[PDB]
Amino acid sequence: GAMAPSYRVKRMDIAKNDEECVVNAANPRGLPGDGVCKAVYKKWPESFKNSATPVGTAKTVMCGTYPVIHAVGPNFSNYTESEGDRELAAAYREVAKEVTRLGVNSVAIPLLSTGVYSGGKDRLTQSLNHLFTAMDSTDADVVIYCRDKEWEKKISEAIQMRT
Ligand SMILES: COc1ccc(C2=CCNCC2)cc1
Ligand SMILES: [Cl-]
Ligand SMILES: [Cl-]
Ligand SMILES: [Cl-]
């Protein structure tokens, strides 16, 4: 584990991460997809061999020795708020299991279901809180990746609030 496990946030492409493994914001069919998923496909295409996995699950595939954790958050266009909420919480629990299993000291993680799977709603706080609930019991350095200037500020505030 990390000597003093931390949370950090950076505003940049997760494909350029400086961590021991990456979480993909995957689709259930292991398709190239859009957003983080598309960047992950361009950087680690080998990781998409048999990556298909059901909603609320995570499946790790190695690109070389570099672990890609395909986490499938729900598309809130398809789920009810209640059921989507359950599946989003579950995807993050499965990420925490996989990060523990791999024995990595760091992980790069996007906010699941905050892009084209958000159903046109701001789910920053909902997604980040499910991330904290899953990852708080792990000793991995967590680095959250985002693209929006205002989201970087709000994620940074939420991290600092608890320190
Ligand atoms: C209209 O509902 C939404 C949908 C998406 C967003 C985001 C803004 C910045 N990038 C992350 C996702 C915010 C509100
Ligand atoms: Cl970038
Ligand atoms: Cl998304
Ligand atoms: Cl963002």
Side-chain angles (χ1 to χ4, degrees):
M3 272 308 137
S6 67
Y7 285 108
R8 298 173 46 236
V9 51
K10 298 199 292 174
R11 181 177 86 103
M12 53 185 283
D13 187 351
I14 202 169
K16 302 171 173 185
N17 76 80
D18 186 40
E19 288 71 60
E20 290 186 0
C21 70
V22 71
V23 174
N24 184 25
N27 61 71
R29 309 185 172 270
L31 295 160
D34 323 300
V36 155
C37 194
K38 165 56 57 190
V40 170
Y41 185 68
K42 290 192 182 108
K43 182 61 62 175
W44 304 282
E46 294 89 350
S47 81
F48 289 69
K49 179 64 161 308
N50 292 300
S51 63
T53 196
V55 172
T57 76
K59 186 169 195 200
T60 306
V61 182
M62 311 303 285
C63 175
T65 78
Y66 188 80
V68 180
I69 310 170
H70 301 275
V72 185
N75 181 1
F76 282 92
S77 299
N78 295 340
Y79 284 88
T80 67
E81 288 290 334
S82 177
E83 206 58 29
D85 185 71
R86 200 190 45 72
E87 292 291 13
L88 180 60
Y92 282 115
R93 288 190 307 269
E94 297 302 310
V95 168
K97 287 180 202 168
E98 281 294 279
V99 164
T100 303
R101 190 184 59 76
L102 289 165
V104 296
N105 290 339
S106 66
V107 53
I109 184 150
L111 296 184
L112 295 183
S113 296
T114 66
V116 300
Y117 277 15
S118 67
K121 273 170 203 216
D122 167 354
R123 303 190 180 270
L124 193 171
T125 300
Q126 173 183 26
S127 190
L128 182 58
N129 277 342
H130 286 321
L131 192 159
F132 288 153
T133 300
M135 294 309 292
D136 276 346
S137 68
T138 72
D139 61 1
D141 282 338
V142 173
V143 181
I144 301 160
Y145 287 76
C146 67
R147 300 308 295 263
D148 178 276
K149 289 164 150 179
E150 292 311 306
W151 279 44
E152 180 188 14
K153 285 178 174 151
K154 287 182 268 183
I155 299 158
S156 184
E157 283 165 358
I159 294 165
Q160 291 337 120
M161 283 268 304
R162 351 157 75 204
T163 67

